[model samples]
Target chain A: MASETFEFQAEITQLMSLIINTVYSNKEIFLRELISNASDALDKIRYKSLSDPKQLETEPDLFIRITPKPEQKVLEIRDSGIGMTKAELINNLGTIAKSGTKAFMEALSAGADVSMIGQFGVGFYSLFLVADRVQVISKSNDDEQYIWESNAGGSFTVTLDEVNERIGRGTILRLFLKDDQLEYLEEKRIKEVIKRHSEFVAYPIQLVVTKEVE
Target chain B: MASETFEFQAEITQLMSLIINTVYSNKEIFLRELISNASDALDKIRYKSLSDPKQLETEPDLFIRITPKPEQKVLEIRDSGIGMTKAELINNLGTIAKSGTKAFMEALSAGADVSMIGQFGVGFYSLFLVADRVQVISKSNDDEQYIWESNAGGSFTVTLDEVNERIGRGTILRLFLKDDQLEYLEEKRIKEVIKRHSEFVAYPIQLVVTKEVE
Candidate 1:
């Protein structure tokens, strides 16, 4: 299928500019936002798998991985969790103010719950504070793999990733860090941020490290 | 205008029953809810008076008054703050899940803020914990004075109060205490409850005490 580009909702564009320009007091919050989102996705799949075990056939383990590519000035966050379909990517990512976790919870019966931290949809846009561009590659059991990309401009693109299936059934976000924000690509910085904000997250959050040969 | 009766929203009835039966661990929370609500009302009128000073014309003073009429087995809480119109009583009081403060906040532009406490819309129904019947008389600048009454049974009623102009520009709630829950009428008990829960409320919460001749 051909790639499609869509303009963000007016309110969403305004909210993104506000977040990128001034809303947050510290830029480190971007990591917290992404980690919280990863946790929510993991919770969703874990809850869904309770009703239908088949949902986990592709990716049974649920965890979050943070990989820093300092040479490329990129930081990636990946999670083995429920991923979004084409329509969901449009509805959940393109809109602002509405909480996806809240909507998901309301659609289910009682007893099903998630410790969702992002109540307002503006959290995802905080990535713009540290990154000039962001790319999200996701694969869901219900749909084909798709990649969503945005430069924090007025619009974003969604394309079919016909060649890659390595994600199995999860989501990966690659952030192209801005020149001034390259500090986030450091392993030490990310570890400190995670320790301060998300050390108690239910799932394991692993960071990739390169070892020197003796 | 004549007084009129209205049924509580179906969701409100369910929520009221839930609160009356088991939702809160402590019945003392009822005082907190009412005081919090009174504080919010005071905040609203104060904020409104910033742009339109006439909002405080009818009642210049802003405070919360708790009067215990033990002989009559009624406890009354009155606020000299922004009151509710007929429609607002239906929308804000009758509804169970929508937050009036949130809706009010969203309706305003930026820079205006309030320290609102109740968010679930169920807090008002907590009055049913200690009362067999609850009555609210409110006078708003936007509309005529009205009285709202409910037994926490399946429905509630609202009536036009043409005879009284005493409330000026605020709301007064009268709770007909359930025989077993009459301890709330004690001034000492009420004062302790306020100190424990609402000591920091922005508005002054004064309880009327009747002293015997020495």
Candidate 2:
């Protein structure tokens, strides 16, 4: 099937602009937000496995991996967790502000602390603070692999991933870092961010390192 | 149009049974849950009015009123806030567990605290602890007044409230109290619950009292 595109919900469009342009002063929380989401996904599947053991048949081990490619100016965060179906992706990512958008916008306009974004449950959009574009490649047991991509340009596309089946049962987020935010493409920076914000997260968060062989 | 009946979402059905049968130890939190939802609706319209002043033109005052009908064994909690359109009623109340049902169920099965219901965003269902039947009458600026009725028996009905247009803006929840839960029908008990749980809520909460006349 052809890649389908969807316009972000009106409130989400406004929220995207606000988040990408002005809301967050400390941009490193993007990693925290992404990691928190990864943890939630892991928690979901872990909880599911308790009822249906097959939920863990493909990937029994759950963890988060952060890989930084400075050369390409991209950072990848992957999780062996319960992934989203196509409709879930659209519903969860395409339309936010299920209940708190107005208050969030009001808080932002009133110059309330940036933490209000987290309180309003739009933490996922914080990724736009560092990435010019994002590709969420995910595979769920109920659906085939698909890629949900956006540039925070008020619209997104979901394309069936016919070529890659690398993600067996999880999600991978490839963030094309903005030129000015290339520091995120460094392993040390990501490690520091994790330590500062998610030091005690239940799942192991590993920073993939490339070492030279003799 | 004739009243339309719809089955509850699968997860909501399970949740309602769990809540109504086993979850809460202190059923008085039902008042807290209703008041909290009332506050949320009021906040929504209050925030909306900032951009569109007409949202408040119909009902400028935002408050919550608790009316107890001991004779009828009904407890009504009404709010002058952002009411529901038919669609909002279905989307918000008809189908819950958008993402957390699995985790919520897991927590419940694990014998987690009753507060887990609140943590799981199923606070609204707590009404069943004290009431056998609930009728939600709401009026939103976008649509005509409607009543959503349910007996927590896996289905609900939504009907146009054509006969009465009393609610200018906001919602009224009339809970038919369980025989043993008649304490909620007392002004003192309801006041105590509000004072303990929602004392600092921004909106004024009033209890309707009847005085003897000569």
Candidate 3:
């Protein structure tokens, strides 16, 4: 239930709050942001595998899987790609080290297309727009499976979880939806968001709508 | 010499200086911003021509022409598309009418990827990042040719251009390059910028590098 807790960078904390309140005007874009991140993660391994085929040996077929569970009030997205390591997870999730964060911050204050979904590269933080708690499980061939969880309440925790290797490679995102943002549980809304932003993506994006319907 | 001289909106003055001095950290992005705007203009006409074929009767081909005049210290971008009317020009250039401008301003202040040119849709104001004096000459099927000029000194002027019909339809951007921003006149830099941002754009982007070399 708990792990190595970490504090977010001062700027990142400010950015997340700004995004949750000011930057994201539409809540529907949370799906778009997550899907775009999954597509990007998939692309990373696809590009890497081109040079070294061994990387794809574990999971050759690349795809994005989205499942919505209304009974559980959770939406999950899984992808086959290059997953993160402990260091990467700490640096990427706990701080604004991408250098573009300063630039992204400037854009937020100067004004930008907040509704363009993933334009600013901080699309991952948009999850806070809909979910109260978020969980990320990732498995890299070089490292053991790990779980990263955050409630957007100023801190996050990452723990080594060799217990559930559900994802042999790549990453899985579980969004614990908020009471007010439950409309995202509907398959129809997710499909619409994907069609709007990721229809042209290279990987196949499949949805498990039956779970939500039943 | 002058048909009509007008003043920019107060917000335009603030936005332009903010973009020139604070928002854009790179000057080469001016080309990407302008080219992106040209492509958007061409796409507008392409969409309109689908409904009204008569609009494209004069200029059947949709393309972006970039000319670098080193001797004259000016860079030009021409596009055959739906040109703006007098009121449209005033509203678009002299005021922040596009909803994305607010978003762009916020992004600039919040910090964003400066290389991701045109992400916020305030890409037009990026011209001030490189050019000291910017001129726009345009002709729509519905309106006569007009020239919009600004020196980045907090004011812009628009007037009727009766002497020149260089563009039969659409718009032309003549950027008076700053001495330090002369690298933009080189073909190599232009190609790199285009490849970086607008390579997959729907319209063809052609460069007249011969003028720069000669």
Candidate 4:
């Protein structure tokens, strides 16, 4: 299938504006949110293998991979767990239901600390707080490969992917960083963010240190 | 206006289920979230008073009060910061957009550690993790008194208050504790939750111990 583009509801647009503009003070939380999400996917498959062995039949290794590509100015968070089916993609990236968008903004407008980590599914949107665009290439055993793309402007597009199979039973999120967000391309910043918010996550977060000059 | 009931956009229902079920492990984080939001409010007014001074003309003392009415099985997180008006209440609480709900759910379903603090917006919803219902009564400098109430079901009701003016220039969130969550009704437990997650909040969180028999 070709790509299908869907516009966010009016309310979604308003909420997205606050997330990008004011909700979180630290831009680094984007990595925490991604890592948190990846660790979760890993947690699921690891748990399912207990009752249903077949879930692990595809990818046995349960871990998260963070690859920072400076040449392309992109950061990727990949995991091996329960990936999203086509339906999963729509219900998820299509509409966010968690409350607090308005409250968060209200908190900020009223001079609440901007450092608070937002709730209500806006963690992914925090990517918008840094990067100008994001792409999700997800696969679940129940469905085929698909790519979900958005620029945090107003809408997102999803399409079937005939690309190489990079994951067995998880999802891969690729963040195309903004001009000012290039700092995230550094391994050091990624490590710091992980240590601050996700040090206690159950899964092993794998990202190697890179030389500042090299 | 009479209390207006708004049904959550169906997506909120599913995500709320995950937050209540999987996202947070420590039930005590509910207090942390409330305290954090309150601290934000206090931080704002404290900062504002520095510039305008008039903002603090009404209620200059900045602090948070945690009152547990065991007799009624209720817990309150009150802040002397910026409050919400009828419009602010509807936009802020009625439509939250903090993001990460989908990812948080994925993490939970994957069986990740339930210790995630989540974001501030979702933090409020965490009250549903332990509360059967929540009532948020607030007053902003720009508007009069208002109340936002929810049962974690699919709908929430908002109304203008014509009753007691419990707060001067901030907000009060009263949680109707679930029968099993009555432990939160004790001053000791409230103190413990605060110390665990919010010991360092810029604002002083005040809750005193009381004799159980007295």
Provide TM-scores for the models: 0.45, 0.49, 0.47, 0.47
Predicted candidate 1 versus true structure: per-residue lDDT over B100-145, tens digit per residue: 4344334222332222214545467678878979888898999977
Q: Which candidate leads in lDDT?
A: 2
Interface RMSD of 1: 34.9
Best to worst by lDDT, what's the order?
2, 3, 1, 4
Model 2, residue A152: distance off in Å is 63
In model 1, which residue pairs have backbone atoms overlapping below 3 Å? Answer: B3-B159, B3-B160
Each candidate's DockQ score against the native complex? Answer: 0.00, 0.01, 0.01, 0.01
lDDT digits (tens) for residues A1-214 of candidate 4 = 4788888765667766876776556778777788777877777778778988888878776778776766468888888878899878877775655466666667667876444544644566667777778889887888977889888778888887744234667898888988888888775677777778776877666663322110
For each candidate, what is the lDDT? 0.74, 0.81, 0.75, 0.72
- lDDT by residue (B104-204, candidate 3, tens digit) is 66766778655543766567888888888988988788887788888977667788764443365799998999898898888778777887766677776
**Cand. 3 Cα-lDDT:** 0.75
The DockQ of predicted model 2 stands at: 0.01
Could you report the Cα RMSD, in angstroms, for every candidate shown? 27.0, 25.9, 25.2, 26.8
Model 4: residues with Cα > 4 Å off, grouped in runs:
A1-214, B22-24, B117-121, B208-214
Which digits, one per residue and each the tens of the lDDT, describe model 3 over residues A9-49? Answer: 87778777777677556677777777778888898998999
TM-score, chain A, per candidate?
Answer: 0.85, 0.93, 0.89, 0.88
**Candidate 4 lDDT, tens digit per residue, B6-112?**
87755467767776665445777777777788888888888877788888866767778776656457787788897877877776674655466566666667775
CA deviation > 4 Å runs, candidate 1: A95-119, A163-165, A212-214, B1-214
Q: Indicate the docking level reached by candidate 4.
A: incorrect
